[PDB]
């Protein structure tokens, strides 16, 4: 994708993170596990929900066909009527399909963006107190217990402390 | 010790399309196109439709004797007419401005039939021999029940001068007609007078019909033709009929009591015995989707029609193998 | 010591909408939808419109005596007609192909009235008693000023054969009419001849009108009806009138001197005494915006009409609290 | 936003920078202040101006309604005319509103992109001669006077000199 | 030692437009708009068009003697008619429902002319003096070849009663007409009977025409007028003609053997002697582009028409100076 | 562009790389030259090819004009017919031109994205074994022969080895 994270330098998603779209995985001497980042997840839910409702409501006012009949010597206007009704259907079909194509591409990129931004947020906290492995992970120079891990998820990781 | 950033995956096989790539598997998606219907004609919002069955709007309104089912129809939501109803004009001819009338019915939900010129009132003319074998009823020759085919009495068709005044609050649909005889001999044989006319007048209308003699092919075993006309008689206005032959006179006329949204739907289907909030010629719709692809002509609170086979929006993200 | 990268903020409260978020506050924005008008009918580019007031296009062109204001109207930009003008056809009847004529006027900015058949020229017929109480003028019975209602003289209506030749460079709009009497007695009482006709011919036209007797309701106190017809007589062509009764003859006819863009606007409003470069039925527009939402039917150099309540583009960036 | 800078790792804008959309804030022993980056600002003004004119001119050719009248027995074609005129209005209303929605989103992202790119431009000059604080600021290892600051804004910051 | 990341550049000068920037030079691009045509009218898919040249659809079908070229035309793909063909109705008049007929021809690729009422069969009337100097052929007075202008024989025009039955499998296009004389004297001089009519009947049709006398301007040196009518006679149906004067009778009528896609194209161009798979009024198209800007009215397998001067998509990337 | 690489921190393209859209240039004691990155190049070819075909096929169903004639007293419906035929042409012209504008902008950005992502891929391998020069190049701390260079292009650059 455009932002290089999803199926990029982060090779795959996690079956094991069920409580969110984006988050953290930690491992140390006490154990390991997954923790969803609630803020970025909730921003994502709001963006996508608004998008869907925006798409629905923009296609709210749209052409409606009506039955109209014509006799055997009104063939021209009958045909005019048919081309008009058909013309508008094709226009709205085009609008609908293109909108879905375009916004689908944007929705996938949006998720990629949110993942990269979360990765950078953590990178900018850790700075040179950890090795950037190149696959989404940071290996610490110091032992980092669960309290330490939590502070990375907090935004609180006290850099000068380590 | 390490911390890793990552994203969700699941067992989803749902796919979406984009401009650059097709069939991208995602973790979550949302279909927005309704593809199914129940395949039935149904009551719209409780209110049952008028299902004309084998009759047409003409056969109904003129009162074709094969269409007694619809002799006093209650309020409808929409109307259903076949593509080629068999019981149209039993006696061959034309219906003048038929389409403009049908269009007028899309604004109408209920008629109430009333008598304006009683059949017994024709004391100078014979009102009970105006029948034909082309319009049979229970083995015998009959005729359009709402109009009176008048013929001469004791070899005399004196000039008719009758006038109805719309004292009702509601607009009135009046129907009448003219008979075109086969030859010069049939004119005298039915009406005696060789040259005839029918003059009709309202506040707006100013008509004068003359019968036209011509050699016709038989249609339903008859060479003669009937040409039916109509008008909307406003409140407090009066219609005036003067004629000396060939007159098909009004017996009954319909009051327009209820106006509003309606439609004439083209369908071979029959009553589903069923209820819905959105109806199509192929079946009814019950869904919360913003779009459907069933049929363009709908009635009620419906989704928007598109010609798509598939509309699915990504909500989640690119799912991992 | 440090250096920081950053971006602009200000006291702006302007908001824009996006697909994913609504009411996003930005530092700068640009409205592109014109929402206001002045509420007046105005001169378009200096050139004042024809404001028919209580008259209709028919009352004007035929010369209804209540419409003397418009007896010789100068060049117009557009025309303004009410929805239900009171001074239409004072003597009841019809105007044949009225809509096709009105449509012809959207291509016309100026008529010049000229006399083609002088009123004095009718030496064999009575041309000065063709009036009715339905078309009053200053307390007395009058008539459409541009056509002559001819009746018999000394109990004789001999056949009329008159012919006008368009020697003008400009297409000519000619109006005439036929009178439908009430009964067989009124026909003789006015024209004597029991069976009458009017035949009209040009290079293209080939007409033959016959009056139609029928019992009508009174409209403006008259049972009789007038049915008005028209044609465009090309340069160097001649119109030919032959009749033996019921003829409403041309007196004056309009030359089409100026063609071009124009329109018949429907509005109850009156002259604003005012100038504009873009006019709507609700008022005039003066703005540089690419869009407006006032009214779809406009004339002049206008923005494009949309049904939006709001169109605002972001130019600046997301503003900080 | 998609690029993570605006209302991202740079938490808020600056009331105090009035001469541009993007720029620098410096502080050292001699004092402090704001300086707009003219190049990226002017690129932004050109992009947005072209966009607006592009939007205006694409909606230049667009449907225009005309008055047409019909008698009492031309109800079908009158209705056809009405559905046609209305149909096109709805199409153009849709086009206009959607275009504004879509391009507004793109305009906000464009600004976010320009801010991130300016931040990276400076980051790639300073390299390891400064601490990346994580909030848009770089704290220098050496004293950086106004001449030094100006060279960072120049593109001239002589890395081997410090 | 170093490694660098970079991207392609080349000598390309191709440019594309975007929302924010115009005339951006790119390394590769793809034009998608076809701008050229060959400027000729051509065979569509092998099948040559009907090129009416100076004749019109009327002159052709009625059989104007100047249009002998098209006396038995083979199957066509499309039809080409000029804007103002000189050989239309040589004898002045009208063609009734002409446009509805032309529209019917867009569904037709081939007629086969057959004789329904032989010219020799008129033993009680004179069938070989129905000619005029307005329709010349080789210096002499002639007439529309497919219809017979009948006049009196030995000072007698007795009533005509002729009837044709469509025993063919294919729908039949029948043409006939009525003659409007100049004055009361010319009526007797040609047909004797002062009051005449023509009655035409099928299963559907019920017509009665009366000639209309009026003073006309000369058109092609004739004051008289001809008014031509038509119908589609279905299989197994019969048309019935009764008249006592002014009758222009069918000689030949066209069988509709082939239906399908076709069109009447308006063009001053002549046959290019050429083949194509997509044709316009300005020339033919041979390209694989999805769009073109030649002309909106096309026939065949064509690209989609747009009013653009330029549509070019970027494929490569921003090229370096 | 949005991603900052093309005509950004990488100032210009390379006339000398003819076998691909994106790739590497190396120089060491043995010599120098260009090598296209086939994977990212081929991803780009597939994206753009699909895009073009998507654009073509969406405009596949679209309004078609038909010849219809009217007499001298059918001026209203003739005009209705004209406004209808013209209205649809303007709609489809708008759709086509806007689509091209919008997708062209996206296509240029896509290329910029692919270049940035390739640059980051290499950056995340080299890590602190090379100097990030700031112009698209990495200068090595150790001698890097052609085998070494190839491993950077591989994805195989053995970081702990140097
Ligand atoms: C079909 O039949 C209907 C009903 O049978 C006909 O409607 C009726 O038409 C007649 C006229 O022919 C009217 O007669 C009188 O109408 C007015 C009423 O005026 C006011 O008063 C009533 C009573 O409250 C009120 O309801 C009305 O709304 C109105 O405000 C009389 O004034 C009038 O007499 C007038 O006297 C004036 C002064 O004394 C004079 O200046 C006038 O010149 C005039 O002589 C008249 O006697 C009925 O009112 C009317 N019915 C209704 C319900 O409106 C209908 O005409 C007929 N159609 C046709 C085509 O014949
Ligand atoms: C309504 O009235 C108008 C005007 O009063 C009528 O228009 C006029 O119609 C008559 C015919 O009835 C024409 O008469 C003569 O026209 C031509 C003129 O020819 C050329 O010369 C003039 C002079 O410069 C030039 O302006 C013309 O443009 C043209 O080039 C005469 O040649 C013709 O006589 C002919 O002589 C030929 C050789 O000698 C013969 O072969 C011909 O057969 C013919 O005899 C004739 O005398 C007027 O020209 C014409 N006026 C105008 C301005 O065009 C109009 O016809 C009338 N309408 C109706 C329906 O009656
Ligand atoms: C124009 O001319 C054509 C042909 O010249 C006319 O068509 C013909 O019309 C006549 C009636 O006037 C028909 O005559 C007979 O038709 C049926 C045929 O019935 C079946 O058998 C045939 C033979 O295989 C089959 O092809 C048919 O499809 C059909 O299944 C006869 O049965 C009928 O006689 C009937 O006998 C019944 C029992 O004995 C009685 O109940 C009936 O009342 C009736 O007497 C009759 O003799 C022709 O069939 C018909 N030709 C064709 C090809 O269809 C056409 O009518 C004419 N037009 C006009 C306007 O006059
Ligand atoms: C995010 O996480 C960090 C690290 O886990 C949080 O800091 C820790 O917060 C806990 C709970 O408030 C503190 O516990 C307290 O300890 C004191 C005495 O030690 C006791 O008096 C209290 O009753 C309580 O048990 C703990 O001190 C602290 N640990 C560290 C290493 O800082 C931080 O509060 C969180 N911040 C946010 C914004 O979520
Ligand atoms: C951007 O900024 C840097 C640093 O501020 C500029 O370098 C400085 O440029 C000034 C003005 O040209 C130089 O001043 C000159 O000093 C010499 C002798 O010292 C004198 O002969 C001249 O008359 C003038 O006063 C100054 O030397 C120089 N300082 C440093 C530390 O480099 C640089 O020119 C600017 N570059 C761009 C592209 O804007
Ligand atoms: C990508 O490139 C790296 C470095 O160029 C590749 O490693 C090298 O691969 C070559 C070819 O397979 C190896 O050559 C072999 O050498 C052994 C003994 O030295 C010999 O028995 C074999 O016949 C062959 O000649 C070479 O050892 C190796 N060099 C280094 C420094 O690792 C690597 O294979 C490539 N990987 C991918 C995924 O493309
Ligand atoms: C009111 C009346 O005259 N009714 C007659 C009817 C009409 O005279 C006729 O339809 C007017 O066109 O004709 C009826 O008899 C028909 C015969 O007139 C015809 O020659 O042959 C028909 C058989 O196909 C039929 O017998 C009729 O319609 O049945 C008799 C009716 O009382
Ligand atoms: C030219 C002429 O005959 N003018 C008459 C006029 C006409 O005879 C009549 O309108 C033709 O239909 O009639 C006038 O008188 C009217 C009476 O004919 C009618 O019976 O009652 C009317 C009152 O509502 C009226 O008196 C007319 O129009 O006023 C008299 C006019 O000179
Ligand atoms: C079948 C027949 O009567 N043919 C005549 C023809 C007609 O009588 C006439 O067109 C019916 O309207 O008239 C022809 O002669 C014309 C004269 O009638 C007219 O007065 O002057 C004309 C010269 O412009 C012409 O001479 C005709 O059409 O040529 C003679 C034809 O046999
Ligand atoms: C994307 O997937 C759809 C759905 O499976 C594919 O549509 C099928 O295509 C096969 C041939 O590959 C046809 O035989 C079937 O008729 C299609 N099935 C359905 C349900 O539509 C489609 O081909 C795929 N598209 C691409 C570009 O890979
Ligand atoms: C965005 O702001 C607009 C403008 O203030 C809001 O529109 C108002 O909504 C309130 C209810 O919240 C209504 O009572 C008013 O009638 C609206 N005012 C105007 C001027 O339109 C809108 O609700 C906001 N939208 C969202 C999604 O938050
Ligand atoms: C982009 O380039 C086009 C093509 O060269 C320019 O179009 C020309 O504009 C000049 C004036 O600059 C006119 O004189 C010509 O008539 C145009 N030529 C063609 C072939 O169209 C266009 O002006 C440029 N647009 C921008 C915004 O720079
Ligand atoms: C997918 O996983 C869900 C767990 O949320 C489970 O309910 C469902 O049965 C699974 N379906 C398949 C096909 O594996
Ligand atoms: C409509 O379908 C829904 C399922 O979405 C179902 O709950 C219900 O049975 C249906 N409602 C009605 C009123 O038929
Ligand atoms: C916003 O700030 C500007 C300074 O440019 C000032 O002119 C204006 O008065 C201020 N408006 C408000 C509401 O604070
Ligand atoms: C139009 O409005 C502008 C403000 O945008 C104003 O300057 C001017 O008074 C108006 N112009 C005319 C010609 O009425
Ligand atoms: C551009 O370079 C190509 C090499 O692929 C060459 O064929 C062509 O002649 C060159 N054109 C110009 C104008 O330099
Ligand atoms: C059509 O044009 C192509 C070039 O794209 C050319 O090869 C060929 O000559 C043409 N084909 C036909 C059938 O005229």
Do B199 and B258 lie in one domain? The reply is yes
CA angle E255, E256, E260 (to 5 degrees): 165
Q: Is B11 helix (H, G, I), strand (E, B) or coil?
A: coil
Partners of A31 in beta bridges: A28
Cα distances (Å, whole numbers) of residue C281 to B182, C68, C98, C266, D87? 57, 25, 22, 6, 21
| Domain that residue E195 falls in | 48-269
Q: Is the CB of E307 under 6 A from ligand 12?
A: no
Pairing of strands B312-314, B29-31: antiparallel
CA distance B37 to B288: 13
Question: Among all ligands shown, which has an atom nearest to the Cα of B217?
Answer: 3
Question: Among all ligands shown, which has an atom nearest to the Cα of D158?
Answer: 5
In angstroms, how far apart are the furthest CA atoms of chain C?
120
Do C223 and C263 lie in one domain? The reply is yes
Question: Residue B108 is part of a domain; what is its CATH number?
Answer: 3.90.209.20
Do C259 and C281 lie in one domain? The reply is no
Residues with Cβ within 8 Å of C46's Cβ and at least 6 positions away in sequence, in order, are C275
CA distance C126 to B279: 67
Question: Residue E2 is part of a domain; what is its CATH number?
Answer: 2.10.77.10
DSSP-assigned letter for residue E235? T
Whether A75 sits inside 8 A of E104 (CB atoms) is yes
Q: Write the DSSP string, F61-107.
A: S----------TT-HHHHHHHHHHHHHHHHHHHHHHHHHHHHHHHHH
Q: Pseudo-torsion of CA B152, B154, B158, B161, nearest 10°?
A: -70
To the nearest whole angstrom, how far is the Cα of E184 from the nearest Cα of chain C?
A: 13
Q: Pseudo-torsion of CA F99, F102, F108, F111, nearest 10°?
A: -80
DSSP-assigned letter for residue D143? -
Residues with Cβ within 8 Å of A154's Cβ and at least 6 positions away in sequence, in order, are none
To the nearest whole angstrom, how far is the Cα of D159 from the nearest Cα of chain B?
A: 33
Do E173 and E207 lie in one domain? The reply is yes
CA distance B196 to D125: 107
Do B159 and B244 lie in one domain? The reply is yes
CA distance B160 to C190: 26
- Please give the structure tokens belonging to residue C96: 């044949």
Do B118 and B261 lie in one domain? The reply is yes
Q: Between A58, A63, A127, which is nearest D87 by CB? A: A63
**Positive/negative CA dihedral, B256, B259, B264, B268:** negative
Note whether D110 and F2 are within 8 A (CB). Answer: yes
For E315, list phi and psi in degrees, rounded to 5: -120, -50
CA distance F3 to E279: 46
Q: Is the CB of A109 under 6 A from ligand 4?
A: no
Q: Is A150 helix (H, G, I), strand (E, B) or coil?
A: helix
Note whether B305 and B317 are within 8 A (CB). Answer: no
Binding partners of F (≥3 Cβ pairs within 8 A): A, B, C, D, E
CA distance D153 to D41: 13
Pick among C213, C216, C226 to test the B interface (most B CBs inside 10 A)? C216
Q: Is the CB of B23 under 6 A from ligand 10?
A: yes
Closest alpha carbon to F14 in F31, F44, F37, F30: F37
Do E88 and E29 lie in one domain? The reply is no
Three-class HEC string of chain C: CEEEEEEECCCCCCEECCCCCCCEEECCEEECEECCCCCCEEEECCECCEECCCECHHHHHHCCHHHHHHCCCCCCCCEEECCCCCECCCCCEEECCHHHHHHHHCCEEEEEEEECCCHHHCCCCECCCCCEEEEEECCEEECCCCEEECECCCCCCCCEEEEEECCCCCCEEEEEEEEECCCHHHHHHHHCCCCCCEEEECCCCEEEECCCCCCCCCECCECCEEEEEEEEECCCCEEEEEECCCEEEECEEEEEEEECCCCEEECCCCEEEEEECEEECCEECCCCCCEECCCCCCEECCCEECCCCCCEEECCCECCC
Residue B131: exposed, middle, or buried by beta-carbon count in 10 A (0-12, 13-18, 19+)? middle
Cα distances (Å, whole numbers) of residue E48 to D63, E45, E79, E113? 38, 8, 9, 19
- Please give the structure tokens belonging to residue B197: 């006319």
Do B157 and B199 lie in one domain? The reply is yes
Whether E6 sits inside 8 A of F25 (CB atoms) is yes
Domain A1-162 belongs to what architecture?
Alpha-Beta Complex (3.90)
Cα distances (Å, whole numbers) of residue A38 to B9, B28, C40, F19? 17, 18, 58, 45
CA distance D92 to D100: 12
CA distance D34 to B224: 99
| Cα D101 versus chain centre, distance | 14
Do B89 and B222 lie in one domain? The reply is yes
Pairing of strands C291-292, C33-34: parallel
Note whether B253 and B152 are within 8 A (CB). Answer: no
| Cα C33 versus chain centre, distance | 31
Q: Hey, how many other C-beta atoms are within 10 angstroms of the C-beta on C242?
A: 20
CA distance E177 to A62: 49
Helices (H), chain D: 38-58, 75-126, 146-154
Q: Is D16 helix (H, G, I), strand (E, B) or coil?
A: coil
Closest alpha carbon to B191 in B216, B215, B213: B213
Instruction: Provide the domain count of chain C.
Output: 2
Residues with Cβ within 8 Å of B288's Cβ and at least 6 positions away in sequence, in order, are none
Chain breaks in chain F (C to N over 2.5 A) after: none
Report the interhelical angle of A75-126 vs E98-105 (nearest 10°). Answer: 60
- Please give the structure tokens belonging to residue C91: 């003597």
CA distance C113 to C70: 11
Cα distances (Å, whole numbers) of residue B201 to B243, B247, E192? 12, 15, 38
To the nearest whole angstrom, how far is the Cα of B145 from the nearest Cα of chain C?
A: 27
What's the C223 CA to ligand 1 centre distance in angstroms? 18
CA distance F15 to A85: 54
Q: Is E36 helix (H, G, I), strand (E, B) or coil?
A: coil
Note whether D60 and D40 are within 8 A (CB). Answer: no
Q: Pseudo-torsion of CA E63, E65, E69, E71, nearest 10°?
A: 30
Cα distances (Å, whole numbers) of residue B136 to B53, B64, B294? 18, 9, 40
Pick among D72, D73, D78, D91 to test the B interface (most B CBs inside 10 A)? D73
Note whether A100 and A51 are within 8 A (CB). Answer: no
CA atoms within 13 A on the CB side of E142: 18
Note whether E318 and E26 are within 8 A (CB). Answer: yes
Q: Pseudo-torsion of CA E88, E89, E93, E95, nearest 10°?
A: -70
For C188, list phi and psi in degrees, rounded to 5: -70, -40
Q: The tokens 């043409």 sit on which residue?
A: E175
Note whether B124 and B158 are within 8 A (CB). Answer: yes
Cα distances (Å, whole numbers) of residue A150 to A24, A25, A34, E137? 10, 11, 12, 106
CA atoms within 13 A on the CB side of C308: 26
Q: Is the CB of C236 under 6 A from ligand 2?
A: yes
Do C37 and C176 lie in one domain? The reply is no
Note whether F3 and F109 are within 8 A (CB). Answer: yes
- Please give the structure tokens belonging to residue F66: 């038909």
Do E130 and E199 lie in one domain? The reply is yes
Residues with Cβ within 8 Å of A129's Cβ and at least 6 positions away in sequence, in order, are A140, A141, A142, A159, A162
Closest alpha carbon to A120 in D118, D5, B2: D5
Do C67 and C166 lie in one domain? The reply is yes
CA distance E278 to E45: 8
- Please give the structure tokens belonging to residue D31: 């004092």
Residue B73: exposed, middle, or buried by beta-carbon count in 10 A (0-12, 13-18, 19+)? middle
Q: The tokens 């009416």 sit on which residue?
A: E52
């Amino acid at each position: 994708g455009l932002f290089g994270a999803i199926a990029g330098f982060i090779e795959g998603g996690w079956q094991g993170m069920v409580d969110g779209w984006y988050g953290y995985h930690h491992s140390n001497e006490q154990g390991s596990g997954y923790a969803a980042d609630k803020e970025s997840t909730q921003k994502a839910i709001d963006g996508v929900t608004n998008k869907v409702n925006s798409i629905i409501d923009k296609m709210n006012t749209q052409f409606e066909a009506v039955g109209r009949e014509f006799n055997n010597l009104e063939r021209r206007i009958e045909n005019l009527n048919k081309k008009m009704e058909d013309g508008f259907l094709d226009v709205w079909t085009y609008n609908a399909e293109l909108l879905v194509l375009m916004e689908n591409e944007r929705t996938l990129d949006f998720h990629d963006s949110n993942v990269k931004n979360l990765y950078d947020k953590v990178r900018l906290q850790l700075r040179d107190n950890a090795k950037e492995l190149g696959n989404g992970c940071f290996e610490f120079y110091h032992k980092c217990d669960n309290e330490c891990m939590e502070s990375v998820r907090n935004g609180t990781y006290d850099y000068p402390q380590y | 010790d390490q911390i890793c950033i990552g994203y969700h995956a699941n067992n989803s096989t749902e796919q979406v399309d984009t401009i650059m790539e097709k069939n991208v598997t995602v973790t979550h998606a949302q279909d927005i196109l309704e593809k199914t219907h129940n395949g039935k004609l149904c009551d719209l919002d409780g209110v049952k439709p008028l299902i004309l069955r084998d009759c047409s709007v003409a056969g109904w309104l003129l009162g074709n004797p094969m269409c007694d089912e619809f002799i006093n129809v209650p309020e409808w939501s929409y109307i259903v007419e076949k593509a080629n109803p068999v019981n149209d004009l039993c006696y061959p001819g034309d219906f003048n401005d038929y389409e403009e009338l049908k269009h007028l019915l899309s604004r109408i939900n209920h008629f109430e039939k009333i008598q304006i010129i009683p059949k017994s009132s024709w004391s100078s003319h014979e009102a009970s021999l105006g029948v034909s074998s082309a319009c049979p009823y229970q083995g015998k020759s009959s005729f359009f029940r709402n109009v009176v085919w008048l013929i001469k009495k004791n070899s005399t068709y004196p000039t008719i001068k009758r006038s109805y005044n719309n004292t009702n609050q509601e607009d009135l649909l009046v129907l009448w007609g003219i008979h075109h005889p086969n030859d010069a001999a049939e004119q005298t044989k039915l009406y005696r007078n060789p040259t005839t006319y029918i003059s009709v007048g309202t506040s707006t209308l100013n008509q004068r019909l003359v019968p036209r003699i011509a050699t016709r092919s038989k249609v339903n075993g008859q060479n003669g033709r009937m040409e039916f006309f109509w008008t909307i008689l406003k409140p407090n206005d009066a219609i005036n009929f003067e004629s000396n032959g060939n007159f098909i006179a009004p017996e009954y006329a319909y009051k327009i009591v209820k106006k509003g949204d309606s439609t004439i739907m083209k369908s071979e289907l029959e009553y589903g015995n069923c209820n819905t909030k959105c109806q199509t010629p192929m079946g009814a719709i019950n869904s919360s989707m913003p779009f459907h692809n069933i049929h363009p002509l709908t009635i009620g609170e419906c989704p928007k029609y598109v010609k798509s086979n598939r509309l699915v929006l990504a909500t989640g993200l690119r799912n991992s193998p």
